[PDB]
Design an enzyme around this catalytic site. Structure first.
Site, PDB file in Angstrom:
ATOM      1  N   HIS A  55       0.809  -1.231   0.000  1.00  0.00           N
ATOM      2  CA  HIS A  55       0.000   0.000   0.000  1.00  0.00           C
ATOM      3  C   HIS A  55       0.838   1.275   0.000  1.00  0.00           C
ATOM      4  O   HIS A  55       0.290   2.373   0.146  1.00  0.00           O
ATOM      5  CB  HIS A  55      -0.982   0.028   1.179  1.00  0.00           C
ATOM      6  CG  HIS A  55      -1.693  -1.273   1.403  1.00  0.00           C
ATOM      7  ND1 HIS A  55      -2.461  -1.874   0.429  1.00  0.00           N
ATOM      8  CD2 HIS A  55      -1.749  -2.087   2.487  1.00  0.00           C
ATOM      9  CE1 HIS A  55      -2.963  -3.003   0.903  1.00  0.00           C
ATOM     10  NE2 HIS A  55      -2.522  -3.172   2.135  1.00  0.00           N
ATOM     11  N   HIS A 217      -6.529  -4.720  -1.395  1.00  0.00           N
ATOM     12  CA  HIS A 217      -5.854  -6.020  -1.333  1.00  0.00           C
ATOM     13  C   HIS A 217      -5.938  -6.841  -2.608  1.00  0.00           C
ATOM     14  O   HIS A 217      -5.781  -8.049  -2.552  1.00  0.00           O
ATOM     15  CB  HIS A 217      -6.446  -6.843  -0.202  1.00  0.00           C
ATOM     16  CG  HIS A 217      -6.165  -6.278   1.140  1.00  0.00           C
ATOM     17  ND1 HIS A 217      -7.056  -5.466   1.804  1.00  0.00           N
ATOM     18  CD2 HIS A 217      -5.066  -6.351   1.919  1.00  0.00           C
ATOM     19  CE1 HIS A 217      -6.542  -5.103   2.957  1.00  0.00           C
ATOM     20  NE2 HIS A 217      -5.330  -5.619   3.048  1.00  0.00           N
TER      21      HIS A 217
END
Lengths: 354, 354
Positions: A55, A217
């Protein structure tokens, strides 16, 4: 095709680069976590978060004055384990308590809740903020609630300015929880990411399909729909933010005075005409920056038509999903006091202003 | 698969977004160019650049105090025409002259040279800096020299700080030209970009191929070689900066006192043991930020073995090529005076420090 060496080593090599690149950060080992070089800062609430790798810059890019005191990276798309979180918090406690910012996922919640209990038992004053801004939820059996996505960044900055100003642990938690109830997010994908240990993307998409309501994700979204144009895409996103804005749910927060989890029912109101907002047009990983300006252009038109005033904006890659081609829109309702916290100094690898 | 509407409108919509997002910028129309909201700044040398669209944030993201006074975007991967450049320079002249920074391409050179003569004839004091940092050149007959890539950004910042502290036009030009002689770049691609008017990417690559020595206009590189690992890739890049660092070539600069072009043979020396450098690891568009930290990790090792000291670094998306999957490395030789110009305030959409 990934810029990596051995698969076992991908994170060791990237975290080594991070430490070498940023003298303001300290990479701690055994277990591995990152803190500001001068942590712990005495007499201020320490702010900690963490989550899977993949991320970047979230969360290690937000460590510094006016934001996070430290962050706990996990494996790719996997929450950090309680041991990292425990040690990280012990490292940054400045005598005033530690606030843990937790994105709403099963793994994250479990791991951060476990560390919280462990911390309290070692005499660390701690409480929690859960982020659940992603308004896209598939109509099925389940359970996990709403996901924590790009609004985590905006709350980290605003709560970080409050901590830095010298607000108490409770005042900081209260602001974080209030802001959680006022921030709304939606993401889309035109192409999937590939995890290093995959050799093929999360999912596949025809040239005229988009994955709507996507997380961070690499998961497919809430559904596959036609991709027609930027304006149409932005329009379905903006409309969804409005129609799914209202939300009632049960959340747990650590009550440190009583040594237990306090459950609370909390309500989100939708954005309404007259609201003032901060807008985040967030790159999910591989979208050209120029296209994000095209998105911002349409977003302002729809905000104006709906009676929303964009007071501040962020445009760029702030909460990503490896090499996913897509973006998210986050709108967070603010006021004069919140804007002053936005404009306050922040000195981090990913956000810097003075 | 692109986030656009009608093809005729892509730039119109992205520039609209730029202007609405950034109150410190003024978007001028007919012809279209971008300036600092407070341009012209009286009593300082004005800095101007420009180039094709598709390199965002370069150049419009570098407009602000301590960097560009203004920038002229052209069409996707096409130089702006002399009219934009002329009008932009007229808009930003602060009475102390205008310095044009030009990337070394056939189109850019012709267009910025034409605008230079036009400006001179209108009584504007002007001179030029040419950027030719890319050390990768195909072994063939052609005749365009070395391309201007990511070192343009570092030079714009360093020359921007000198203009801002009040150095004369001549001193700023000499600094820019000197810096050009001390900076070295190389880029690779694992995946091509797609221009909006294409519907197919600019080249195709096997899953174990890379395009080596690639530019910023989506051009294939100087050759295709196997792609094995991050380390091998970085090593071939680093090795190439060294062996191709030595370079002798003819450049023209505008002599505003004589009202003519002044040719000059200029020599680049290769990087050497004991040199101090600024390192830029630049995203060409769609590389995950995490992977760029892995590149920086290897780059630091090779620098140390070679006897180079990295004094400062930039890692991220600073000079792109639409949605190209790849990266470049730029090393620029510096000393105490140059580092102080680097550390000086810069307030732009893409670079901000205090």
């Amino acid at each position: 095709k990934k810029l990596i060496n051995d698969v076992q080593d991908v994170l060791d090599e990237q975290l080594a680069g991070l430490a070498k690149a940023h003298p303001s950060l300290t990479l701690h080992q055994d277990p591995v976590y990152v803190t500001r070089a001068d942590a712990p800062v005495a007499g201020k609430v320490a702010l900690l978060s963490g989550g899977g790798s993949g991320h970047e810059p979230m969360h290690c890019g937000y460590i510094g004055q006016g934001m996070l005191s430290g962050a706990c990276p996990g494996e790719i798309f996997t929450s950090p384990t309680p041991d990292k979180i425990f040690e990280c918090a012990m490292q940054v406690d400045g005598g005033e308590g530690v606030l843990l910012i937790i994105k709403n996922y099963t793994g994250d919640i479990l791991n951060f809740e476990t560390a919280t209990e462990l911390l309290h038992d070692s005499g660390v004053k701690v409480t929690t903020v859960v982020i659940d801004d992603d308004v896209a939820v598939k109509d099925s059996l389940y359970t996990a609630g709403r996901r924590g996505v790009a609004n985590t960044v905006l709350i980290e900055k605003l709560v970080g300015a409050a901590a830095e100003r010298g607000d108490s642990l409770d005042a900081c938690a209260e602001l974080g929880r209030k802001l959680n109830n006022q921030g709304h997010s939606i993401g889309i994908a035109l192409g999937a990411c590939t995890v290093p240990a995959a050799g093929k993307p999360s999912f596949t998409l025809a040239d005229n399909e988009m994955e709507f309501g996507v997380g961070i994700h690499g998961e497919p979204g809430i559904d596959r729909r036609p991709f027609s144009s930027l304006d149409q895409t932005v329009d379905e996103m903006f409309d969804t933010l409005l129609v799914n804005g209202s939300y009632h749910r049960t959340l747990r927060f650590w009550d440190y005075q009583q040594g237990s989890w306090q459950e609370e029912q909390q309500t989100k109101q939708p954005l309404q005409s007259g609201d003032r907002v901060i807008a985040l047009v967030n790159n999910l990983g591989a979208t050209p920056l120029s296209e994000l300006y095209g998105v911002y252009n349409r977003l302002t038109t729809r905000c104006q038509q709906a009676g929303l005033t964009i007071e501040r904006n962020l445009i760029g890659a702030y909460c990503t999903s490896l090499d996913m081609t897509g973006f998210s829109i986050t709108l967070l309702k603010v006021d004069d006091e919140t804007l002053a916290l936005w404009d306050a100094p922040v000195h981090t690898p990913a956000l810097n202003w003075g």
